[PDB]
Design a protein around this ligand. Structure first.
Ligand SMILES: NC(=O)c1ccc[n+]([C@@H]2O[C@H](COP(=O)([O-])OP(=O)(O)OC[C@H]3O[C@@H](n4cnc5c(N)ncnc54)[C@H](OP(=O)(O)O)[C@@H]3O)[C@@H](O)[C@H]2O)c1
Ligand SMILES: NC(=O)c1ccc[n+]([C@@H]2O[C@H](COP(=O)([O-])OP(=O)(O)OC[C@H]3O[C@@H](n4cnc5c(N)ncnc54)[C@H](OP(=O)(O)O)[C@@H]3O)[C@@H](O)[C@H]2O)c1
Ligand SMILES: NC(=O)c1ccc[n+]([C@@H]2O[C@H](COP(=O)([O-])OP(=O)(O)OC[C@H]3O[C@@H](n4cnc5c(N)ncnc54)[C@H](OP(=O)(O)O)[C@@H]3O)[C@@H](O)[C@H]2O)c1
Ligand SMILES: NC(=O)c1ccc[n+]([C@@H]2O[C@H](COP(=O)([O-])OP(=O)(O)OC[C@H]3O[C@@H](n4cnc5c(N)ncnc54)[C@H](OP(=O)(O)O)[C@@H]3O)[C@@H](O)[C@H]2O)c1
Ligand SMILES: Nc1nc2ccc(SC(F)(F)F)cc2s1
Ligand SMILES: Nc1nc2ccc(SC(F)(F)F)cc2s1
Ligand SMILES: Nc1nc2ccc(SC(F)(F)F)cc2s1
Ligand SMILES: Nc1nc2ccc(SC(F)(F)F)cc2s1
Lengths: 251, 252, 253, 250
């Protein structure tokens, strides 16, 4: 029987490339999405045309609130309802926008989005994933290779991604006895934000030593595929940078 | 109005009390923030005001994450400006610490609001308030944890909160540097052990520490805070000083 | 000449042997570098050449630091171009590992030459020789690092200095060689094959500390991360070190 | 009664500032130098004019070689001969120049100089300090930028990473003897004499806190803290003194 994976924020960009590649490797996939319902259903349709009954969608807002734990329970439950099993969780969904310390949404909305999506939802998904266990079980967290050299005015985003490093280590430690590995993939610059102009995109591109270009979504997905694979069966608590050398470049 | 002034969160007992005492001894006026420890906070302010009149005030606030945390953090900073006319130093010391197992009577969302609210979100909001309200020597010191990469079993949310606080330390150092506000951390290993911890378990930890097989005093933690706020650290920002007796170098 | 070629140092036994086997399985021709283990090196080359003729050679060299180490490292890279007409991958695996207490029959200058030469200087000189030779391709270097260098064994200062220096080489060489398309990465085992000396009970002390399975990594599990880093699946990865340590480095004292 | 300190490469720049501030704190000092004989004797004269019999100079080459161990033993012995004790070792001397991987010193000389001064000599000085043994400690001058290194400085960067390794390993091993071992990691402090003014300003503009390099005295302040009674539970720590430079992305 084919294993099953949940990918959060899988309708577009990097999470889509991860779900496509897990699907190409033989997984059945839950395509989680928040707002991108058309893109989500479309991808599931494509994957189901390739092999029948192998993809479902699941809608959830991963903002922090008193119902986030139930929404995280439901995402995991949807994998067991569809596939009877849940072998892999990829924490990919993320909010990303500036929160300047010196002066739009209220500050507690910014905290709920940037800490909720980037850190607390991964924690609750990890709890739900682990508790539902009755094989090569793992979790991969999408981290950020530049968290020690952050973008100016992104403190809450940075705080959430440092927290996700902490979860990666703490959950690896705690879930090792259950045979669940927990690792991360840390892109530098990959698919640039859609709102970004080409000129600004090129400023970032020119900083990358290996090829002066951003990672493709497939290149990020390749490292996720490695970490879920049997070739990573002794790896837990590791974060693999996939950044073309960007984090080595001084100011 | 010539003496500088400091806010210390969770200043009634243990490490925050030692910090407040040592800043006061260095010549600071101090705000002693407390949540539940009113009697101890006031007892410390009485002690400091006897030494030097009108140099210590108390400020009550809960630092749990909520819709009101922003107002509570604004009020802590405001209380320093009201009392003393200025606020030179913020010490983010208050902290919740307890296990949160992944495989399982506070709701999980309450555990979040305390372990992430109190240890990371409150420092972030206090930082925004402190910065907004600004030969000055302005700085923030965050109480971090030297064992963040080799954490205690079943302490995920606490670990998450202390990693978030490293992220705040670095991001705020970068962004506030133009304002001349330095932002640094002090990372204890084992210092005063939790009051709830058993004696045998305390000794198990002390035996691990390379440097003298004992925990740090609160005053040893405070000494690193005093260095970082001083004129001898005026080029230091974004730095976290471990004060752990070598504990974090010891393999399993 | 369509098959790529790889140099693996210290490849006669244990982890380097497993790396040379997996690279060969992947379609690489291999130079099996050895120092003292000639019989084991030759035996591996004969096994590999039985599988596919003319795909494995051995190369003997001492990688201790000295006046002649630069010429030795140049000769190891040259051996790969003479055997196979190309050198696509260098794996810096050879290593000396023994205690060097700070407080009290090798002299300390011999200890320095062996521990810093094998773990750090020889990798640097091999890296220089590999790059100088390179002026469809997927050129990369993988350095065998150590996941425990921040929580080191007592009295191993020179060993730990050499492995920290190797992290620095991995980063500096990644940045400097990225314009030539040469990626430079590391694999950091925690406990893998335990040193031949140790008795089952002492091996068992270390095994019991590993969260993931309470056992050491096989040599092949370490090799698997090397295979990933040299592969087309890692073509944007440079300057990275992959721990393969079962969670050991997360475990407090 | 006054404690004594060895500072390597103490004739000029940051090591000089460290020697001065230790002396101002009450220490007797060995001013180690290699080539800067006039500047070393001149500083010793200035310190002894302030307090007689409190400064000596000691000449040694800290390039790696089969005689480096004897030179490092001699530097520690010079402190005991002058002052009868040695409480503090500051590993400050350092070669710094590029060593490109792709192409008038031989590569074997560049390895001996950059790995010997930045790493091997500190190790042997540590061994000699420990063996010859109050608030004993060693401070290693590290580099805040070693994970974001200058292009073509691989051997320098290898030496400074090795010095982090030594700081940790010796802190662990010497803790039972009460010897603390810590580091201070400048970002940009006093820029190299040979560097042109235009390049100096390029580096200054990158520093978030003040858009200026650290003074030698600001670096020495962090050394004074780590040797002080206010750092008695600190060992294996490296303090960055870099004005935020290491936080700044490309
Ligand atoms: N892209 C890069 O250069 C880069 C660099 C470093 C790290 N990363 C990390 O790599 C991962 C993938 O990057 P990306 O560029 O593909 O991410 P992205 O496009 O910014 O976000 C991916 C998805 O996250 C989901 N999301 C956002 N807010 C949400 C909420 N409140 N609830 C539920 N879902 C939410 C969205 O789903 P809907 O569209 O369905 O609403 C969005 O499409 C992220 O974790 C990111 O931080 C990326
Ligand atoms: N003790 C150690 O060995 C050690 C080790 C590593 C790191 N640290 C760090 O060092 C710092 C000080 O440690 P410590 O042992 O002195 O801390 P602690 O005793 O656990 O807590 C300090 C104070 O924090 C306040 N606090 C807790 N929850 C709060 C909430 N919801 N709102 C407002 N205040 C709250 C409490 O004040 P009230 O009493 O007024 O309610 C408490 O007295 C902490 O940040 C800690 O994580 C300590
Ligand atoms: N095994 C582990 O648990 C572990 C843990 C952490 C890191 N690592 C790292 O992973 C790599 C492989 O580990 P391993 O256990 O397989 O290594 P190993 O057996 O200790 O050493 C590998 C080979 O290194 C060669 N070597 C030693 N000194 C040499 C010199 N002076 N000149 C030339 N070659 C020399 C020897 O070759 P000859 O036999 O031909 O003389 C030896 O067989 C090493 O870099 C090690 O530091 C291993
Ligand atoms: N300046 C900065 O911006 C900066 C930045 C990062 C880290 N650091 C570190 O901080 C420390 C002090 O910096 P600095 O700029 O003051 O250093 P420096 O001026 O470059 O060097 C200090 C002294 O080291 C001695 N030295 C060099 N080669 C030697 C050899 N073969 N044998 C013995 N001594 C030798 C020289 O002594 P003589 O003059 O007597 O020959 C030299 O004056 C160094 O460890 C450096 O790596 C400095
Ligand atoms: N959720 C998301 N996180 C990031 C982080 C960095 C980047 S690349 C950039 F914008 F240059 F920093 C894009 C995204 S989208
Ligand atoms: N708020 C607090 N945080 C910590 C972290 C560690 C410790 S020492 C211990 F408990 F051994 F890990 C005590 C406290 S109290
Ligand atoms: N060359 C070598 N390096 C190491 C490092 C660790 C280990 S595992 C051990 F010994 F438990 F630390 C074996 C070796 S063999
Ligand atoms: N021995 C020495 N090491 C360094 C490291 C950096 C610097 S600052 C510079 F050069 F901008 F990198 C000067 C020196 S002098």
């Amino acid at each position: 029987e084919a294993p099953a994976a949940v990918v959060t924020g899988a309708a577009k960009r990097i999470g889509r490339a991860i779900a496509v590649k897990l699907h190409q490797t033989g997984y059945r996939v839950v395509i989680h999405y928040h707002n991108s319902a058309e893109a989500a259903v479309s991808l599931a349709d494509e994957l189901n045309k390739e092999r029948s009954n192998t993809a479902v969608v699941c809608q959830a807002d991963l903002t922090n609130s008193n119902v986030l734990p139930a929404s995280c329970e439901e995402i995991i439950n949807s994998c067991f309802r569809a596939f009877g099993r849940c072998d892999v969780l990829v924490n990919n969904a993320s909010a990303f926008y500036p929160t300047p310390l010196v002066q739009g949404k209220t500050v507690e909305t910014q905290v709920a989005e940037l800490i909720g999506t980037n850190a607390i939802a991964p924690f609750l998904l990890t709890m739900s994933f682990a508790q539902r266990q009755k094989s090569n079980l793992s979790i991969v967290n999408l981290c950020d290779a530049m968290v020690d050299q952050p973008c100016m005015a992104f403190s809450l985003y940075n705080m959430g991604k440092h927290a996700l490093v902490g979860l990666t280590q703490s959950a690896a430690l705690e879930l090792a006895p259950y045979g669940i590995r927990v690792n991360g993939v840390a892109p530098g610059v990959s698919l640039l934000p859609v709102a970004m102009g080409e000129e600004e995109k090129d400023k970032w591109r020119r900083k990358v030593p290996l090829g002066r270009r951003e990672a493709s979504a497939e290149q990020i997905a390749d490292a996720v595929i490695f970490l879920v694979s049997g070739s990573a069966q002794y790896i837990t608590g590791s974060i693999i940078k996939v950044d073309g050398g960007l984090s080595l470049v001084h100011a």
